[PDB]
Design a protein around this ligand. Structure first.
Ligand SMILES: *[C@@H]1O[C@H](CO)[C@@H](O)[C@H](O)[C@H]1NC(C)=O
Ligand SMILES: *[C@H]1O[C@H](CO)[C@@H](O)[C@H](O)[C@@H]1O
Length: 336
């Protein structure tokens, strides 16, 4: 049966009794999750109008959906509006107010999310911990955060996941466009990323799952961002990153690093000295091109001893800025 809800309490009470759930203009109570977990397999969820959220300092999530064979859709013109400026204080998840993560897709398996627009997330947007989940035509509009104190507004954080496909995302934020902390068989294609910290593998290490395998980030553009292409592995951690491909990536307006691969990463600041417990093997860059800003570095590779091997880099051409004086343990066939 089809059900339309204009309040969160009714939707939560009746979600398992509905095979199509329409969420129309819901104001989600402060400090609570719009909890659409535990759906019956096959259910379709449609967001309509503007979903809003009450103000409270808490960790979230604002929205959570789970189940098998779930189809999540944003209707034309729909928005999930976090009004994140109520929390933004320049400090994100590193300090200041406690700020709620936006959208949990944990165990949203053999499922899809299409056409969702998120506006002004308080902090990170999608937390993905699922198998066989596609996210298509997603828009993250956090542009207000450029001037109003947005920080740590990651669009897609992935861990403990398999068979994730992200297609035609459009992101304007202040942190990673994608951050693959762990996972296997992951595709990001057709994306436009602006404002943030780039298309990132990692940080990898220091968690329960520190394994990244078979990831393709392709046919995408990164503009007006701190980094273009980034792989970050945690200083002193243990894990592995293998079979990663960046292909057909264009970048411009990059402030810090066009391409940065570093094995000294920490959330506060990298140490400057890499370690070798998170090997990066079978990394392919194919046709990664564009420009960096005058004060940026084109390519920076800071690998540990023996922990970067079997790389294939072809068609890499990054102009502007300066060449790095700091690269370490650069593999055969690769250059800064
Ligand atoms: C790598 O991942 C892609 C997409 O998830 C998949 O189509 C492909 O079969 C995977 N390769 C292997 C060897 O599993
Ligand atoms: C959720 O919605 C159903 C109708 O779909 C109600 O019967 C229930 O009481 C709750 O309001």
């Amino acid at each position: 049966a089809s059900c339309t809800f204009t309040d969160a309490a009714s939707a939560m009470a009746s979600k398992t009794a509905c095979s199509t759930i329409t969420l129309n203009n819901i104001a989600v109570p402060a400090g609570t999750t719009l909890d659409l977990t535990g759906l019956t397999s096959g259910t379709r969820v449609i967001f309509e109008g503007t979903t809003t959220f009450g103000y409270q300092e808490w960790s979230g999530p604002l929205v959570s959906i789970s189940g098998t064979d779930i189809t999540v859709q944003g209707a034309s013109g729909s928005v999930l509006d976090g009004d994140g400026a109520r929390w933004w204080d320049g400090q994100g998840s590193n300090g200041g107010k406690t700020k709620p993560k936006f959208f949990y897709a944990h165990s949203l398996d053999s499922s899809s999310i299409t056409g969702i627009t998120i506006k002004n997330s308080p902090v990170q947007v999608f937390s993905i911990q699922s198998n066989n989940l596609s996210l298509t035509d997603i828009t993250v509009d956090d542009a207000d955060g450029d001037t109003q104190g947005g920080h740590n507004t990651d669009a897609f954080d992935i861990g403990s996941s398999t068979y994730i496909t992200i297609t035609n995302a459009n992101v304007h934020n202040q942190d990673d466009c994608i951050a693959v902390n762990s996972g296997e068989n992951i595709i990001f294609t057709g994306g436009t990323c602006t404002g943030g910290h780039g298309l990132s593998i990692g940080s990898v290490g220091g968690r329960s799952d520190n394994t990244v395998k078979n990831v393709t980030i392709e046919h995408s553009t990164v503009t007006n961002s701190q980094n273009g292409v980034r792989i970050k592995t945690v200083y002193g951690a243990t894990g592995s990153v293998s079979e990663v491909t960046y292909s057909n990536i264009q970048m411009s307006g990059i402030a810090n690093y066009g391409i940065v691969i570093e094995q000294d990463y920490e959330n506060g600041s990298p140490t400057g000295t890499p370690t070798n417990g998170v090997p990066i093997t079978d990394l392919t860059l194919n046709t990664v091109t564009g420009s960096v800003s005058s004060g940026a570095t084109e390519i920076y590779i800071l690998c540990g001893s023996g922990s970067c091997s079997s790389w294939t880099w072809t068609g890499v051409s990054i102009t502007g800025g300066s060449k790095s004086t700091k690269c370490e343990n650069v593999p055969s066939g690769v250059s800064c």
